[PDB]
Coordinates of C-alpha atoms in Angstrom, one line a residue:
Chain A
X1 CA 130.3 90.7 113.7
X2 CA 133.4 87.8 113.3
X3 CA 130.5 85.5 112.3
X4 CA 128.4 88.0 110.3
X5 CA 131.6 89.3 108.2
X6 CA 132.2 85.9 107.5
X7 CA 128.6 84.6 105.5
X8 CA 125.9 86.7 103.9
X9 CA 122.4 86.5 104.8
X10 CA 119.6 85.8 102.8
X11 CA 116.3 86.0 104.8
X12 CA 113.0 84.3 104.1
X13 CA 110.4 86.8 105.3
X14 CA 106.7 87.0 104.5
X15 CA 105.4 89.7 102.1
X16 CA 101.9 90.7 101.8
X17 CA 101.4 90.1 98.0
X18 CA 103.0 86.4 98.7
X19 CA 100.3 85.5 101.9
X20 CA 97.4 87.0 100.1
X21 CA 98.2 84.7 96.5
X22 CA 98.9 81.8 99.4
X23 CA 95.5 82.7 100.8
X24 CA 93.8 83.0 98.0
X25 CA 94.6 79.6 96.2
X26 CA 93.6 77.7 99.5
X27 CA 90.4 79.5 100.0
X28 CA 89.9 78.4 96.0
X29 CA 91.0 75.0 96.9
X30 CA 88.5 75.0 99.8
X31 CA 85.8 76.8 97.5
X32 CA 86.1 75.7 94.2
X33 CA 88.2 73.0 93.8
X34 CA 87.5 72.7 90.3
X35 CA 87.8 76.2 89.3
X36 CA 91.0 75.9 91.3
X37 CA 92.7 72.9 89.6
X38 CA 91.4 74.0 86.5
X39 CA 93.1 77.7 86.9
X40 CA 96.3 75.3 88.2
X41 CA 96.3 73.0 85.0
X42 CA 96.4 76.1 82.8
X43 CA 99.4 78.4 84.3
X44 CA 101.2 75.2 84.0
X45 CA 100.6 74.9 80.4
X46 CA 101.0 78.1 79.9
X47 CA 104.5 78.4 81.2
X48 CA 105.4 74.7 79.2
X49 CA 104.3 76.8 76.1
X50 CA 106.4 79.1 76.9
X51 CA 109.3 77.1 77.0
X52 CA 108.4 75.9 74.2
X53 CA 108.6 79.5 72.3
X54 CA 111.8 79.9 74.0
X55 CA 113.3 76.6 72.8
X56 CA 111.5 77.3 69.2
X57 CA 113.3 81.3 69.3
X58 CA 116.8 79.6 70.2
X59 CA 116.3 76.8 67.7
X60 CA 115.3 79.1 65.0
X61 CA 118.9 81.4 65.7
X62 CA 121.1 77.8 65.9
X63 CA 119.4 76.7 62.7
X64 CA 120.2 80.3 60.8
X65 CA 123.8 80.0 62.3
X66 CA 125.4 76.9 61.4
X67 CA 124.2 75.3 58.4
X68 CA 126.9 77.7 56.3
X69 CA 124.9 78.3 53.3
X70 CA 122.0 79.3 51.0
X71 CA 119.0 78.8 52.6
X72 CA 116.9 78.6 49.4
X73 CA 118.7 75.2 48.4
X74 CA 118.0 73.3 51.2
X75 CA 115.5 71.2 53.0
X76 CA 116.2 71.8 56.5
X77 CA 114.7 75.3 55.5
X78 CA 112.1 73.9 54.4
X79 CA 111.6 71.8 57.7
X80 CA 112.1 75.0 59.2
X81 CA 109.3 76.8 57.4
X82 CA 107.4 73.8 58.5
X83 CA 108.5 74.3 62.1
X84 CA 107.7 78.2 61.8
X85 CA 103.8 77.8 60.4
X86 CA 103.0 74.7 63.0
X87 CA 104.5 76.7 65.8
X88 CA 102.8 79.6 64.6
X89 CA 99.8 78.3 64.6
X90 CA 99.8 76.9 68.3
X91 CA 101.0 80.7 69.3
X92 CA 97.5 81.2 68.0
X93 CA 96.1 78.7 69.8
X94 CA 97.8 79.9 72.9
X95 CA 94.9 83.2 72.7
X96 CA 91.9 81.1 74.2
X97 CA 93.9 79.8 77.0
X98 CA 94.6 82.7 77.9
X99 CA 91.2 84.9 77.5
X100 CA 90.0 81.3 80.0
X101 CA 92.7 82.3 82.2
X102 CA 91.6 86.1 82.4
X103 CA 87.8 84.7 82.7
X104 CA 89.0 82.6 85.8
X105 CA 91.4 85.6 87.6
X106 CA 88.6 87.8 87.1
X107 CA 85.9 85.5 88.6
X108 CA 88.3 84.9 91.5
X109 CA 89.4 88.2 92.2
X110 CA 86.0 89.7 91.9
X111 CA 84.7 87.5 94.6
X112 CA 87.6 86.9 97.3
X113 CA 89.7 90.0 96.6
X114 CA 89.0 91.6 100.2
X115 CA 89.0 88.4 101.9
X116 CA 92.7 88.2 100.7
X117 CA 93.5 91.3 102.1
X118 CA 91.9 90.8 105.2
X119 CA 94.0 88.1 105.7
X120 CA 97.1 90.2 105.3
X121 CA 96.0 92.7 107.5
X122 CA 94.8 90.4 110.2
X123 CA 98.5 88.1 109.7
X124 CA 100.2 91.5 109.6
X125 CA 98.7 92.7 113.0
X126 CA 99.3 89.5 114.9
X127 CA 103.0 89.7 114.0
X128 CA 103.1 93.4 114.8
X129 CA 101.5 92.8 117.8
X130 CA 104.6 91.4 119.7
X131 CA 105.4 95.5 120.4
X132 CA 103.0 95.5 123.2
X133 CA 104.2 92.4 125.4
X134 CA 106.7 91.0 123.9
X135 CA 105.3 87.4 125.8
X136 CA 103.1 86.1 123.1
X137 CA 104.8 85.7 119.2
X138 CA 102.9 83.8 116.6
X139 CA 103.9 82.4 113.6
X140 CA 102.9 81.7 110.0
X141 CA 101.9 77.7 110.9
X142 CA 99.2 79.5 113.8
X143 CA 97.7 81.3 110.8
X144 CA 97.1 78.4 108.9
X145 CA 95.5 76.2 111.7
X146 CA 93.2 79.4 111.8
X147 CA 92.3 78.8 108.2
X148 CA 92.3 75.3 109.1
X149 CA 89.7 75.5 111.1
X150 CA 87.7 78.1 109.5
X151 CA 87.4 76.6 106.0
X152 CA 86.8 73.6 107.6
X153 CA 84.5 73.9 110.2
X154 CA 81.3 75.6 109.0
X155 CA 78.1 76.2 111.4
X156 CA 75.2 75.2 108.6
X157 CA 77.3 72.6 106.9
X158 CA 74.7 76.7 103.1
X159 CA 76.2 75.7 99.6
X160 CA 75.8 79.4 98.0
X161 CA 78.9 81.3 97.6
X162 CA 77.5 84.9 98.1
X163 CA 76.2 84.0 102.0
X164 CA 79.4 81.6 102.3
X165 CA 81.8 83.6 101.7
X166 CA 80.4 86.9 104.7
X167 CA 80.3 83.5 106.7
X168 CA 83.8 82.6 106.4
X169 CA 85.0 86.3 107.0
X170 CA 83.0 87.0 110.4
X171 CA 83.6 83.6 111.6
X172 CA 87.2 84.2 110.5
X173 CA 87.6 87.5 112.2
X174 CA 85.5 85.8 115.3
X175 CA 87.8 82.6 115.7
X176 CA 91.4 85.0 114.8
X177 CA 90.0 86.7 118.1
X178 CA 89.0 84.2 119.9
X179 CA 92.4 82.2 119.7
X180 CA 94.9 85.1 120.3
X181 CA 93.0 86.6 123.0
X182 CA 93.0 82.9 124.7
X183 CA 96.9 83.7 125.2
X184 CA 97.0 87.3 126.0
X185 CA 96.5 89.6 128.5
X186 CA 93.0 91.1 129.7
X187 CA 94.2 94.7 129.1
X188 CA 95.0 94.8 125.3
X189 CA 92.0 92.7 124.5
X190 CA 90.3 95.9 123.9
X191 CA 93.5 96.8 121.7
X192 CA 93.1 93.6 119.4
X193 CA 89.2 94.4 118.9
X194 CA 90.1 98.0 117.8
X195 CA 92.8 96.8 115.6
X196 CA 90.7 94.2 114.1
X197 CA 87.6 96.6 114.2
X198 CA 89.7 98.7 112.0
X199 CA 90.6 96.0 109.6
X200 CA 86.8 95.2 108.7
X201 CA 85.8 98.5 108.9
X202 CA 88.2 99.0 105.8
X203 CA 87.4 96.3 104.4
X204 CA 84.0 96.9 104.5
X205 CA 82.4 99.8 101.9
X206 CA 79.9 102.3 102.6
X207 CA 81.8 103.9 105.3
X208 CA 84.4 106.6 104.6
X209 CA 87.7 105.2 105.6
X210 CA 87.8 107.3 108.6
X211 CA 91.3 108.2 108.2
X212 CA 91.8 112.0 109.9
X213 CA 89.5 111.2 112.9
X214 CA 91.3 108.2 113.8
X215 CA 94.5 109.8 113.4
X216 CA 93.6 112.4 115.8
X217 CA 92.1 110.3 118.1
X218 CA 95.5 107.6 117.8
X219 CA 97.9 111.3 118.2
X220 CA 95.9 113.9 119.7
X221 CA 98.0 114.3 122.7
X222 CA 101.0 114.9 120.5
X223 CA 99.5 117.6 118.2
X224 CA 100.8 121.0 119.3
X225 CA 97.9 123.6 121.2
X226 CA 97.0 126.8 121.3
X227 CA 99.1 129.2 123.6
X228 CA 96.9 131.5 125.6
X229 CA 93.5 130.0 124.3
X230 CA 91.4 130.0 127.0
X231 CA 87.7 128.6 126.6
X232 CA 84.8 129.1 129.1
X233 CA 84.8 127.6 132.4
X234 CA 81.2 127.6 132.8
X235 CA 80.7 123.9 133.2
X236 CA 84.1 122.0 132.4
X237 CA 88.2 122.5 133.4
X238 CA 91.0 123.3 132.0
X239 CA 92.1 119.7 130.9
X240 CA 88.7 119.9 128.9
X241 CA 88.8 122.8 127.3
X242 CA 92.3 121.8 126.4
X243 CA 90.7 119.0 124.7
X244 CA 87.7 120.4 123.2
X245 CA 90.6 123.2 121.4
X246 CA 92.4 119.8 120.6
X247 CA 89.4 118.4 119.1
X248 CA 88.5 121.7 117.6
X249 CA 90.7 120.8 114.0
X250 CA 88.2 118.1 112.6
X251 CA 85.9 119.7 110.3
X252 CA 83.2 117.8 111.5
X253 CA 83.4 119.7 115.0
X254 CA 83.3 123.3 114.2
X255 CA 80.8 125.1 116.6
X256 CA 81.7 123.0 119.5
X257 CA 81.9 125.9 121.8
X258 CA 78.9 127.1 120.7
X259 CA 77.2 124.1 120.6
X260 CA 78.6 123.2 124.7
X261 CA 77.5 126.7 125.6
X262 CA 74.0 126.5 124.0
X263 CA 73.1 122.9 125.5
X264 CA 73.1 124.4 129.1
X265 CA 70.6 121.9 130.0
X266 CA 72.6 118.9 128.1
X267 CA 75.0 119.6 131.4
X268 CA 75.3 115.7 132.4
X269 CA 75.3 113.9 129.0
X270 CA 79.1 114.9 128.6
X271 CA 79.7 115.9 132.0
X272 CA 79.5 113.3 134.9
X273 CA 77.2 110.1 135.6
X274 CA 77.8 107.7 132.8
X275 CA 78.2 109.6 129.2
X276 CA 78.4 105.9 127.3
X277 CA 75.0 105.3 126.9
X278 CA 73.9 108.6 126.0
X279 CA 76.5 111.4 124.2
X280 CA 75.1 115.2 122.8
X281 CA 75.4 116.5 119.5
X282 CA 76.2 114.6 116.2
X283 CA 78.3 113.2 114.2
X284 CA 74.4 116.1 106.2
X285 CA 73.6 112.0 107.5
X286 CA 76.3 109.8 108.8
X287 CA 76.5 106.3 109.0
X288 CA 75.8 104.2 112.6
X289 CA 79.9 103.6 113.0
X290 CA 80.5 107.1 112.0
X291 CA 78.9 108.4 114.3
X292 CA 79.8 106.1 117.3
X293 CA 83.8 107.3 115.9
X294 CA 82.5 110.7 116.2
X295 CA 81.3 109.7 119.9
X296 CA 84.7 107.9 120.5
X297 CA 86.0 111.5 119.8
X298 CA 83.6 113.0 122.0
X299 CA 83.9 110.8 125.4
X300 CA 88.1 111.5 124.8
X301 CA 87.9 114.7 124.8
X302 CA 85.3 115.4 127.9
X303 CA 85.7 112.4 130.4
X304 CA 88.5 110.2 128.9
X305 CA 87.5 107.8 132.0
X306 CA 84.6 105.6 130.0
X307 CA 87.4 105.7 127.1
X308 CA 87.5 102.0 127.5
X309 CA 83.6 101.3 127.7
X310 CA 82.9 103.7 124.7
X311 CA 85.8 101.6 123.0
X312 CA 83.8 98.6 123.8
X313 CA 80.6 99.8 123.0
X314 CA 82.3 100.8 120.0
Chain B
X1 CA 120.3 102.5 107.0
X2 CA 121.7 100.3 109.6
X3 CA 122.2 103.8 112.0
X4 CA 118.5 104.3 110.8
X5 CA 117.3 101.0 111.5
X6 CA 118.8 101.1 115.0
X7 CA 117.5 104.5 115.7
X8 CA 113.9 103.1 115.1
X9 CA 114.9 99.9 117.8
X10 CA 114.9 97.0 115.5
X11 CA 117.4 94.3 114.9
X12 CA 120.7 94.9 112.9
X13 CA 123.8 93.4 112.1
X14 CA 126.9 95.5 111.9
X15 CA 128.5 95.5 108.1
X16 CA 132.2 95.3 107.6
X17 CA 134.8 95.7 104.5
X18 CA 134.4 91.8 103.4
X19 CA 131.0 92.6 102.3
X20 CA 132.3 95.8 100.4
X21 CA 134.9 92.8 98.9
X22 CA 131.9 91.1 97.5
X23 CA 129.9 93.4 96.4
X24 CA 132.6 94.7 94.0
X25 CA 133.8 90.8 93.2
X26 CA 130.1 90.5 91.9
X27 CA 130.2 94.0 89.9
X28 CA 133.0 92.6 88.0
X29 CA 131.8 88.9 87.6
X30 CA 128.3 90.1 86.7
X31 CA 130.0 92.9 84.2
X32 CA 131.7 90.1 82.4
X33 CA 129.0 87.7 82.3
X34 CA 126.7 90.2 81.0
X35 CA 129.5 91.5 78.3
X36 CA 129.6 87.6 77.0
X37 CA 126.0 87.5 76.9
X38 CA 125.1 90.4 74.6
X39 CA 128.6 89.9 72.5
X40 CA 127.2 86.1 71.6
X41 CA 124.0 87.3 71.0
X42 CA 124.9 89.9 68.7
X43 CA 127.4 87.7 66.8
X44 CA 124.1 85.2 66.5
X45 CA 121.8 88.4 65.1
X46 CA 124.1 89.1 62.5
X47 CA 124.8 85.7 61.4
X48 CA 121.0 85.7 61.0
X49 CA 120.4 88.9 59.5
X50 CA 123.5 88.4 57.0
X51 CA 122.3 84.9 56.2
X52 CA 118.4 86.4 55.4
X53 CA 119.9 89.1 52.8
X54 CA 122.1 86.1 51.2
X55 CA 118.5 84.4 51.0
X56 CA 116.7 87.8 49.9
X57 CA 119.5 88.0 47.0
X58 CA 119.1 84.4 45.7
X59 CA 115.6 84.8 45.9
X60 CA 116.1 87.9 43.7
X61 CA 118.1 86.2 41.4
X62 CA 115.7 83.5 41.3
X63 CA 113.5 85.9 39.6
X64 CA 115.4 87.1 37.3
X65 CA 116.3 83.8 36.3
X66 CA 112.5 83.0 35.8
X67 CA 111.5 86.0 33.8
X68 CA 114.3 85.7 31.4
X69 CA 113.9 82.0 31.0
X70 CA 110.1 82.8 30.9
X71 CA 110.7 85.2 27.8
X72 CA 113.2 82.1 26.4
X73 CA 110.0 79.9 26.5
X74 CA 107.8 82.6 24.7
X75 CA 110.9 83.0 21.9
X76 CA 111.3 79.2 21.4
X77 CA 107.3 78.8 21.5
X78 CA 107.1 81.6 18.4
X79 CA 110.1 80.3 16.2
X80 CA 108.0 77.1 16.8
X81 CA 104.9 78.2 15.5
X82 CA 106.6 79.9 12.6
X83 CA 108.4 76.7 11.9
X84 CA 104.8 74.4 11.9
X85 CA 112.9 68.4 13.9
X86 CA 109.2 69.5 15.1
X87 CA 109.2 66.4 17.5
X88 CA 112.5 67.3 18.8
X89 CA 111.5 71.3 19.2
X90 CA 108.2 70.1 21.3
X91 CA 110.0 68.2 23.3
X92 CA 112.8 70.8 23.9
X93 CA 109.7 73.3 24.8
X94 CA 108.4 70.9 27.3
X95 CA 111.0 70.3 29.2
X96 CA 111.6 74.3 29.3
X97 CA 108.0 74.7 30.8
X98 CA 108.4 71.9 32.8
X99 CA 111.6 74.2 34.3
X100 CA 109.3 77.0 34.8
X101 CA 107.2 74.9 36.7
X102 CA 110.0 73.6 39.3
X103 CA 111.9 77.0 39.1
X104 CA 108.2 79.4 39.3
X105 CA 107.4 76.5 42.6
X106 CA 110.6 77.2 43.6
X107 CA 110.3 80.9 43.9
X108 CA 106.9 80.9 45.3
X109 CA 107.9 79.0 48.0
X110 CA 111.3 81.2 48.7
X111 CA 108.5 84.2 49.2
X112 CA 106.1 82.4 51.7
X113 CA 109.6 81.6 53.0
X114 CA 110.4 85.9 53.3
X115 CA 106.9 86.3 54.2
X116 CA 107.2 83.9 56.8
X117 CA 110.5 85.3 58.1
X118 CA 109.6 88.6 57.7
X119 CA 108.0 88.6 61.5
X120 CA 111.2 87.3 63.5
X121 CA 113.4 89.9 60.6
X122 CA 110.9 93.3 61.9
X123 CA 112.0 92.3 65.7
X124 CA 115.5 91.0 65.1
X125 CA 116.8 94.4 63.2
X126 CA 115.1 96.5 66.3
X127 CA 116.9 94.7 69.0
X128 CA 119.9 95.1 67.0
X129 CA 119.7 98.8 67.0
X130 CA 118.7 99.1 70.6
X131 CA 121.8 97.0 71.1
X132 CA 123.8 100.0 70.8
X133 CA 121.7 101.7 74.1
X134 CA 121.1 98.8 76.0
X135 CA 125.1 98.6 75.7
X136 CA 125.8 101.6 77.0
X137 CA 123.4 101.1 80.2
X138 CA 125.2 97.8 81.0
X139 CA 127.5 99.2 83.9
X140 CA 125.1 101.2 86.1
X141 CA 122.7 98.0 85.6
X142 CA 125.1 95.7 87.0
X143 CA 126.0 98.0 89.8
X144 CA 122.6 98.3 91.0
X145 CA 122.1 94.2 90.7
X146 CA 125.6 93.8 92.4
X147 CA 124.4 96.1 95.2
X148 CA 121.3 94.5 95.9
X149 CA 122.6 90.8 95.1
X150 CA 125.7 91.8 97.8
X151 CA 124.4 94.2 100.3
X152 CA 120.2 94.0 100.6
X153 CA 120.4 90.2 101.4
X154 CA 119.4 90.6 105.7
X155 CA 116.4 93.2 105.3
X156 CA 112.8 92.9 104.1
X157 CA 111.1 93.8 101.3
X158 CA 110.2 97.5 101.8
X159 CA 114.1 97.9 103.2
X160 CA 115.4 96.4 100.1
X161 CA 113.4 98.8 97.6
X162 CA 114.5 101.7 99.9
X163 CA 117.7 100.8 99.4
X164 CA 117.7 100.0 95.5

């Protein structure tokens, strides 16, 4: 505190909307260099135009402030008028730049929008990721050596954007894995493939965004459980039927009871032997990660051992 | 937020009076700058505004003066053709239209001049009578900036718009 009352602190931190525009410019440097220069070229003009509106609005209030006079008997008025209409004019001209400009940020957004946030969330989970260990801590410059190396180092060295740019982001995802797990330990590599499992899974469309059933299965020990509910003990404990009235809350699992008591014969698919390969029931269709999140849900809540192999599997 | 902040087992640093010293050192300085500002630039929108009516007037003049020299030219033009000293009287008529000419060029370009002014004149009189809210807002605004320019300098983003 004697040196913190002294000096005020002004910290230079990293903000999502700031590493997503950083990202985004050098995959459009490392994509379309022209498009890229181009789009650079015109937000400079644009913002010298606009000091150049500014300078015009200031000189226009200096000019009808301190000439002390009538303004119809004069020539700098009319040099003024002259000013106005050429000046004018190039504020029209200013309307095409910027419909090119709006052409080029929608071109660019429309094809490396999720990209952009996929680098956020994969930057933003390796810094987060210092909770767990607290051994490894990466900075900013080991993100940019990834992207160093990925928009540099292409297998099939393609030229089509469309193929390119699902390259880039598996071989991104791939090498982001691939160099933190080099450093860190064998028992939260499972962790970092969830985590970044998650990120692509949200980034990816078609599938839900399987918020409730993750939740649950992040904080289903914490939820609060029945008192006095007691389930059968035909062919399972009290640590599973615990569980299974856990579980019970998603709406996808309502007649799981029923559904346990009927499948006498399904007695070794959740119970015992190896319940990774094979798992009962169901996830109405549901998509192949949908369902192995409903199985996830399933091997936690009867034999939380093969957690880790579903997880993998997974 | 810094009992908050170490309740959640992050980094802090502990806050004393000095910065409570600063914060209200930069309420005043930024009260006073900003006071200056809109006082000049109100003084500037009135010099305009006053000087664009003294223009609206001569231009109105201007007109007068054109249609009553314009019915002077139509008098002097009639007691002309009664009278067809007739040298002198052509002449005298010419140099009166040549007059209307300069004087009629004159006006027309004072009202492409009005036309032309017209679009800074719509916006200028607006912010001159939102002046009189935007003044009254001017201490809760540089409160708030002080606050955040004095106090919100250590945290991150989402800390700082918690705080503002």
């Amino acid at each position: 505190p004697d040196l913190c009352s002294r000096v005020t602190f002004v910290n230079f931190t990293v903000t999502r909307s700031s590493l997503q525009s950083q990202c985004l410019n050098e995959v459009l440097k490392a994509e379309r260099p022209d498009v890229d220069e181009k789009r650079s070229d015109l937000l400079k003009l644009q913002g010298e135009f606009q000091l150049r509106l500014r300078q015009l609005e200031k000189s226009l209030l200096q000019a009808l402030n301190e000439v002390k006079g009538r303004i119809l008997d004069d020539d700098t008025i009319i040099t003024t008028l002259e000013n106005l209409k050429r000046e004018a004019a190039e504020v029209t001209r200013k309307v095409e730049e910027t419909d090119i400009v709006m052409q080029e940020v929608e071109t660019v957004s429309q094809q490396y929008l999720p990209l952009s946030t996929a680098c956020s969330s994969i930057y933003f989970t390796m810094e987060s990721l210092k909770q767990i260990h607290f051994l490894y801590q990466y900075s900013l410059q080991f993100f940019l050596d990834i992207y160093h190396n990925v928009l540099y180092e292409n297998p099939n060295l393609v030229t089509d954007h469309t193929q390119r740019l699902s390259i880039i982001t598996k071989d991104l995802f791939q090498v982001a894995f691939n160099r933190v797990a080099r450093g860190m330990l064998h028992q939260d590599h499972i962790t970092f493939a969830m985590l970044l499992a998650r990120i692509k899974l949200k980034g990816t469309v078609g599938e839900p965004t399987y918020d409730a059933e993750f939740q649950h299965f992040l904080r289903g020990n914490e939820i609060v459980l029945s008192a006095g509910s007691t389930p059968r003990i035909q062919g399972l404990t009290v640590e599973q039927a615990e569980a299974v009235v856990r579980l019970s809350c998603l709406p996808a699992f309502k007649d799981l009871i029923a559904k346990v008591q009927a499948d006498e014969q399904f007695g070794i698919w959740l119970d015992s032997s190896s319940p990774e390969q094979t798992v009962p029931y169901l996830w109405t269709p549901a998509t192949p990660i949908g369902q192995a999140i409903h199985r996830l849900l399933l091997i936690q809540a009867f034999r939380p051992d093969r957690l880790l192999a579903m997880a993998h599997m997974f | 937020a810094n009992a908050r902040l170490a309740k959640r087992g992050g980094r802090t640093m502990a806050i004393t009076p000095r910065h409570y010293l600063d914060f209200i050192n930069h309420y005043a300085n930024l009260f006073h700058e900003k006071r200056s500002e809109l006082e000049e630039q109100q003084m500037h929108l009135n010099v305009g505004l006053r000087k664009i009516k003294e223009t609206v007037d001569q231009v109105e003049e201007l007109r007068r003066d054109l249609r009553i020299k314009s019915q002077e030219l139509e008098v002097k033009n009639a007691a002309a053709n009664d009278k067809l000293e007739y040298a002198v009287l052509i002449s005298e008529a010419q140099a009166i239209k040549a007059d209307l000419a300069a004087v009629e060029a004159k006006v027309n370009r004072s009202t492409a001049l009005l036309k032309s002014l017209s679009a800074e004149r719509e916006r200028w009189e607006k912010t001159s009578e939102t002046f009189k809210n935007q003044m009254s807002t001017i201490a809760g605004d540089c409160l708030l900036s002080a606050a955040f320019i004095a106090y919100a300098g250590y945290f991150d983003q989402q800390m700082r718009q918690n705080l503002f």
